Amino acid sequence: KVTLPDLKWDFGALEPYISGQINELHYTKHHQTYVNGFNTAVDQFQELSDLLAKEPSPANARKMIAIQQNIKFHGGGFTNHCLFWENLAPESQGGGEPPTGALAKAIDEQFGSLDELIKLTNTKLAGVQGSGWAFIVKNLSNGGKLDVVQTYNQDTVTGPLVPLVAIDAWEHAYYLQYQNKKADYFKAIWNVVNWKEASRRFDAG
Amino acid sequence: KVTLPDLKWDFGALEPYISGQINELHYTKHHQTYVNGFNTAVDQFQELSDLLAKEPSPANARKMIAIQQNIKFHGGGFTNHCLFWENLAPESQGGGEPPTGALAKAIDEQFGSLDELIKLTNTKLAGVQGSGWAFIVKNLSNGGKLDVVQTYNQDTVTGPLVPLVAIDAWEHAYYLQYQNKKADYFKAIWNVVNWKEASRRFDAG
Amino acid sequence: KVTLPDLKWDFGALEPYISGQINELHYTKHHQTYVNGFNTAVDQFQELSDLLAKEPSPANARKMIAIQQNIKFHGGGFTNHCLFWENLAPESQGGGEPPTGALAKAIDEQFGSLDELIKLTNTKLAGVQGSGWAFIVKNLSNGGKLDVVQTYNQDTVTGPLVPLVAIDAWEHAYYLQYQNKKADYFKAIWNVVNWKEASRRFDAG
Amino acid sequence: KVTLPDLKWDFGALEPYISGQINELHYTKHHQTYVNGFNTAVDQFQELSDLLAKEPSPANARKMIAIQQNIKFHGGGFTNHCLFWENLAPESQGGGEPPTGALAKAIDEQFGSLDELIKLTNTKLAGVQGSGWAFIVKNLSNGGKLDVVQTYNQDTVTGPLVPLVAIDAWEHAYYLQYQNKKADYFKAIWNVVNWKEASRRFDAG
Ligand SMILES: [Fe+3]
Ligand SMILES: [Fe+3]
Ligand SMILES: [Fe+3]
Ligand SMILES: [Fe+3]
Question: Under an 8 Å CB criterion, which residues of B touch A?
Answer without folding.
Answer: 1-3, 38, 42, 45-46, 49, 52-53, 56, 58, 61-66, 68-69, 71-72, 75-76, 78-79, 82-83, 156, 158-159
